[PDB]
């Protein structure tokens, strides 16, 4: 078929900050040993490739973004063993190297080839695989995929169940894991408990649900647009609130109501005032926060340790604490023993030449998630 | 009798910022309805009563300070079945309610009565039991054992051993508990770990201590005064190395020295700085920092966000996170049960007549535990 050969196809390229996407032809080149080409089915439009092309997230340019999806094996490098064509994957954000301090440690996820940290635009190799007009193209996040193929490595794919739905189950890649995760994994959630989480996107609902599924006695989810709340409330919330129609601030309003703030607060919007917000909204003795949104480029808070001295522990993380290649397998075999659900998020499905389209139903404020077809 | 009414006796009376304390005549009336009298026997010099005078911890003055002691129950206000008269005993600066939000919930340990948080002064009830030169004096933080005589609360004093060793026990009060348990109860230092310590004044040395009562495997003590180091060594820190012999900021000469990161960092100092190069120095991924030391009024800090959506997780701590009526006697009988040594921390004994001396000790970086003997 083409493994072996180079496979010229179609993509969204960003070339400018602030500017639309150029859906190109593109020369994607033969699976490096331990590396993969992956065909895809369908992505989902997720805010943090909205950073990007913002100027809120630094990576080097041109670049082709995208990272919620899922598709197809076409070839499998030399030596590549947990996949093979045919086989459907998941295209993980983070990978599982399996050999470094972070992946050795039960509880942490951020394996040190991750291109979060410091960005570098390439392939764990060293390499680009793409090529324009003669011009080469940037890697984002190590996926890459608003594109009609892609070569990943073999640490950061993710076999799946070959009788998943590919159009339903890529939400796993980012929009679920993260919010599930946050609520489940790393806050720790107790039956009980009383959470405030602030940001109601696809990535939040996941949080949503997270709460209600470990057992949540109040789930006060907070907004700004209101037709967020309906979702929600149909998803776990007991009650929701829209900060427009106070007159004191939030933190307070959110404290008076949970008697001096509630057991866990999220931030899933990412900004750096609401960021405070949901650490002042916790019980100061016994709160904790979990800073899931990734926040603007180079911009500080200011806090004063006495916030913190009388006990609120303030954390965050990356993929919801899952581990990458062990965990999603498991979420969406999880996914198919109808233990949850995806469809409820999933709000418009365009054909992949629609991106821009896609990205305007993100902005305006349309979309849970948007899913994109190849 | 000694008890029935309002006794005279000396105190050590703080009437206006920096000044010496002057050692006057003071009448203390009598215990009300649940309240204690204790006639103090041991008291020891901790710096939090001296970030009173230093002005870092404004509290209302006229006041008498002191909060780590030891003594004997004298009178017993009408009510009390917590404790009787006779008894050797301890009194808390946290009280433990019983009925608070804070004291039904497992884990945090900072009850409601407490003037730690918000201060006034008084005993719980909104009254003051002492009064010299017809002007009433407050108290600090609802014990004030600088003093030969004092009536606390009964929700906030322990029982402890009619063995115990008055003079050597009372350092359990603050300086033992607080650094033993933000290691052993609150960072969680798992085994085979990695732990800074940075500071090593009393609290300090029992944070070492507790690191390795845990379990850790390198203890890494960072402190300017040098002299500390013999102590900290033969307690139980691996290395500690001093700050000024390095040109390089101790974040990364810690970093580099530990594989990118110590895995449980604790401040027990006060400086902003020492702050956060304690929570830069501790591993991205799956990092800890504990708080421990009372920062000076209101200096906030500046941080950005994304070195907690890595995975550090920042938090804070009073009272060793042991819960005061509580943990304190089980504490004391370990202590009975040979399970740890006070005499290593002890470095002078004045009697409490020399109150001023003690200061001056702790502020030259002689002494480690001053104990004004009655
Ligand atoms: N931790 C991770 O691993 C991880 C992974 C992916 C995304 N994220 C982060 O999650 C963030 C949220 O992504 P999303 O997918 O949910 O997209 P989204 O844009 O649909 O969600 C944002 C929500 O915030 C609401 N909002 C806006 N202003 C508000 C305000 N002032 N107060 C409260 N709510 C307000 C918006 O109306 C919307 O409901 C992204 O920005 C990204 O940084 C984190
Ligand atoms: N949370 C609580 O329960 C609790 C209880 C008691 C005390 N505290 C607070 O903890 C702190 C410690 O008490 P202590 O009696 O042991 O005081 P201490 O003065 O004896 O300890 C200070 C140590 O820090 C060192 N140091 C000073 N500046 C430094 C710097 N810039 N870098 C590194 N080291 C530096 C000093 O050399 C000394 O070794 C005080 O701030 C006190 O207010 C908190
Ligand atoms: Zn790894
Ligand atoms: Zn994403
Ligand atoms: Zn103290
Ligand atoms: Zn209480």
């Known amino acids: 078929s083409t493994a072996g050969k180079v496979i010229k196809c179609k993509a969204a390229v960003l070339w400018e900050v602030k500017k639309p996407f150029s859906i190109?032809?593109?020369?994607?080149?033969?699976?490096?040993?331990?590396?993969?080409?992956?065909?895809?089915?369908?992505?989902?439009?997720?805010?943090?490739?909205?950073?990007?092309?913002?100027?809120?997230?630094?990576?080097?340019?041109?670049?082709?973004?995208?990272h919620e999806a899922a598709g197809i094996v076409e070839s499998v490098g030399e030596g590549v063993t947990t996949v093979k064509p045919g086989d459907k994957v998941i295209p993980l954000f983070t990978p599982q190297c399996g050999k470094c301090r972070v992946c050795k440690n039960p509880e942490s996820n951020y394996c040190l080839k991750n291109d979060l940290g410091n960005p570098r635009g390439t392939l764990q190799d060293g390499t680009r695989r793409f090529t324009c007009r003669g011009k080469p193209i940037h890697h984002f996040l190590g996926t890459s995929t608003f594109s009609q193929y892609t070569v990943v490595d073999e640490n950061a794919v993710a076999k799946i169940d070959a009788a998943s739905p590919l159009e339903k189950?890529?939400?796993?890649?980012?929009?679920?894991?993260?919010?599930?995760?946050?609520?489940?994994?790393?806050?720790?959630?107790?039956p009980?408990?009383?959470?405030?989480?602030?940001?109601?996107?696809?990535?939040?609902?996941?949080?949503?649900?997270?709460?209600?599924?470990?057992?949540?006695?109040?789930?006060?989810?907070?907004?700004?647009?209101?037709?967020?709340?309906?979702?929600?409330?149909?998803?776990?919330?007991?009650?929701?609130?829209?900060?427009?129609?106070?007159?004191?601030?939030?933190?307070?309003?959110?404290?008076?109501?949970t008697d001096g703030g509630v057991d866990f607060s999220f931030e899933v919007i990412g900004r750096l005032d609401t960021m405070m917000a949901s650490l002042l909204c916790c019980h100061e003795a016994c709160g904790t926060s979990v800073i899931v949104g990734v926040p603007p480029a180079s911009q500080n808070l200011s806090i004063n340790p006495m916030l913190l001295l009388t006990g609120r522990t303030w954390?965050?993380?990356?993929?919801?604490?899952?581990?990458?290649?062990?965990?999603?397998?498991?979420?969406?075999?999880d996914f198919m023993?109808?233990?949850?659900?995806?469809?409820?998020?999933i709000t418009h499905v365009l054909p992949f030449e629609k991106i821009n389209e896609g990205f305007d139903l993100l902005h305006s404020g349309k979309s849970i998630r948007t899913v994109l077809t190849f």
Chains 1, 2 share one sequence.
Request: glycine share 12%.
């Open 337 to 345: 023993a109808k233990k949850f659900s995806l469809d409820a998020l």
């Open 315 to 333: 954390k965050g993380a990356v993929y919801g604490g899952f581990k990458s290649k062990e965990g999603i397998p498991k979420l969406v075999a």
């Open 24 to 66: 190109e032809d593109v020369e994607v080149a033969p699976p490096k040993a331990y590396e993969v080409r992956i065909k895809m089915v369908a992505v989902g439009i997720c805010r943090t490739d909205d950073h990007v092309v913002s100027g809120n997230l630094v990576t080097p340019l041109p670049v082709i973004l995208g």
């Open 169 to 190: 189950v890529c939400l796993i890649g980012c929009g679920f894991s993260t919010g599930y995760g946050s609520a489940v994994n790393v806050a720790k959630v107790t």
């Open 192 to 257: 009980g408990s009383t959470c405030a989480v602030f940001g109601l996107g696809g990535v939040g609902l996941s949080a949503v649900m997270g709460c209600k599924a470990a057992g949540a006695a109040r789930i006060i989810a907070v907004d700004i647009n209101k037709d967020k709340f309906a979702k929600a409330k149909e998803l776990g919330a007991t009650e929701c609130i829209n900060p427009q129609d106070y007159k004191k601030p939030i933190q307070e309003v959110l404290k008076e109501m």
